[PDB]
Amino acid sequence: SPKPFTFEAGERAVLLLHGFTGNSSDVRMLGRFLESKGYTCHAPIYKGHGVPPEELVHTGPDDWWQDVMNAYEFLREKGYQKIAVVGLSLGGVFSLKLGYTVPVVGIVPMCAPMYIKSEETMYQGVLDYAREYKKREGKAPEQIEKEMEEFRKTPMKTLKALQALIAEVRNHIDLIYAPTFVVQARHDDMINTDSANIIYNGVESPIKQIKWYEESGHVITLDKEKEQLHEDIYAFLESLDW
């Protein structure tokens, strides 16, 4: 069962944030890589995440943002003053929000959405996650159907709040001056890839870069170009003034 992680190495720290329906496993390989390069890493798990999908629908972005802020403070409290933030998908949106909320050395949003899917589409996405999760539990197709029958009886009321979160950060990214590396998969079937240009163009950061990953999908940390992504993130972090 996935759990948060903290790898303590050198004095430079990186906060790693996962995406909606994701968990710390989505950033664990990047954490081990950065630890091996001497960076301290911490990845939380948002409320309703890394547990049975049944628990997700009762949580929302107000809960998940508390987890993000508590994670930042966890690093600070351990004496790591200088923190970069790297985030996948929704974690990338939270990376941007931390970037104008609290002191950070740099931000790497990876496949972060700047625009809104419908509540129906977002809900379908939760349903897909729930079924994929039960498949990975090795449950028989019959058992999955019966469980999803039950699951569909409860709506997820916090989805309007997630739409509102995305629009709010979209409209505040002009407050960001921190060095920003925008990462985007070229073909991403989960988000509008125009988001990447919106972030790149919309921040006030004097120091910024963007890279497109040509053969990757949305969950880019788990996909086939992760080795390159790891090197690119490290090169970016090495270029910053800690």
Side-chain angles (χ1 to χ4, degrees):
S1 192
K3 296 274 181 180
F5 65 77
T6 301
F7 302 152
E8 294 188 65
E11 60 184 7
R12 305 179 185 188
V14 183
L15 179 63
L16 302 177
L17 299 179
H18 71 73
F20 174 48
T21 78
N23 55 63
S24 59
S25 297
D26 303 334
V27 292
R28 189 183 287 281
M29 290 178 293
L30 177 58
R32 286 299 297 268
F33 173 86
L34 291 173
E35 178 193 21
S36 81
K37 294 301 179 169
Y39 283 81
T40 286
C41 291
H42 178 49
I45 293 191
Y46 310 149
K47 196 183 172 189
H49 290 71
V51 288
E54 290 82 1
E55 302 180 19
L56 179 64
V57 310
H58 301 291
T59 72
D62 283 353
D63 307 310
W64 312 328
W65 176 239
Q66 286 309 307
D67 297 302
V68 166
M69 278 290 351
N70 289 343
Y72 175 88
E73 296 167 351
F74 179 74
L75 288 173
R76 291 295 302 267
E77 271 155 31
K78 274 178 137 50
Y80 304 88
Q81 295 303 101
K82 295 306 184 183
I83 301 177
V85 191
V86 177
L88 183 63
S89 193
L90 188 55
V93 173
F94 289 144
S95 296
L96 291 166
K97 190 175 175 174
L98 276 169
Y100 59 86
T101 295
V102 295
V104 302
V105 172
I107 305 169
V108 183
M110 305 185 294
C111 312
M114 293 284 99
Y115 273 92
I116 314 284
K117 297 270 193 266
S118 79
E119 291 189 54
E120 178 185 325
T121 308
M122 301 157 77
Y123 190 73
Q124 181 56 56
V126 174
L127 296 173
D128 291 355
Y129 158 67
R131 269 171 183 290
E132 182 45 51
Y133 184 102
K134 300 171 186 298
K135 177 198 178 200
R136 287 191 298 240
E137 294 182 287
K139 285 168 174 169
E142 320 82 65
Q143 173 90 36
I144 303 181
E145 295 323 282
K146 189 222 57 178
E147 283 177 37
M148 290 310 306
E149 177 71 354
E150 190 53 33
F151 187 98
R152 284 190 302 263
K153 306 176 173 298
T154 303
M156 185 163 178
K157 306 212 139 82
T158 54
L159 293 172
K160 174 75 196 277
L162 181 45
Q163 297 178 311
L165 167 73
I166 300 303
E168 169 189 338
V169 171
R170 186 180 63 238
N171 289 130
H172 283 75
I173 60 172
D174 57 334
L175 299 179
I176 295 172
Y177 278 77
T180 296
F181 171 17
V182 179
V183 158
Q184 180 58 55
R186 191 65 71 185
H187 290 93
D188 184 318
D189 285 291
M190 291 288 304
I191 75 159
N192 183 352
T193 66
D194 295 335
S195 299
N197 290 137
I198 294 159
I199 296 156
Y200 180 81
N201 296 134
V203 296
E204 286 298 307
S205 310
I207 306 186
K208 61 181 183 187
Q209 59 181 60
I210 180 161
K211 188 161 172 180
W212 290 91
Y213 291 83
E214 306 279 3
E215 311 300 323
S216 291
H218 179 64
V219 182
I220 186 167
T221 48
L222 291 186
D223 211 343
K224 64 188 66 60
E225 300 185 286
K226 62 185 156 276
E227 319 63 16
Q228 193 54 61
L229 175 64
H230 289 169
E231 294 291 345
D232 294 337
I233 296 175
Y234 173 58
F236 178 69
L237 296 177
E238 284 292 283
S239 73
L240 304 180
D241 164 49
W242 285 78

